[PDB]
Amino acid sequence: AALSGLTVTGVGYSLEARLTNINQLEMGLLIDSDVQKQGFMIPTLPPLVIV
Amino acid sequence: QRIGREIRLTPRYRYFNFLPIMLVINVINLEEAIAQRTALDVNETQVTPAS
Structure with a gap:
């Protein structure tokens, strides 16, 4: 009774394929380097004195 | 944008015709x-008077 009305059919499919080219036409992941340089400088402070 | 090795032949020749004589059978x-x-196809000389 629970299976009354059950019909099962296959609709479609998906297929995995990889394009192994021996010459290849992809650009991968580009690798670079950049330089960030900082400037740190040191001032004076108010004076102290005894008279 | 592909890589491959190729081998090429460069053909160079020509056929000229001089003699204006030739026969075919x-x-x-x-x-x-x-x-x-x-x-034996016979030219029966038809002496049975009709000619």
Whole structure:
């Protein structure tokens, strides 16, 4: 009774394929380097004195 | 944007024609004549008065 009305059919499919080219036409992941340089400088402070 | 090795031939020639003389013969029904009995077409000189 629970299976009354059950019909099962296959609709479609998906297929995995990889394009192994021996010459290849992809650009991968580009690798670079950049330089960030900082400037740190040191001032004076108010004076102290005894008279 | 592909990589491959190729081998090429460069053909160079020409056929010229000088002599304006030549003959051709056509052969037909060669097999049938030897396949079947053939003999002796007579020019029967029709002496049975009709000519």
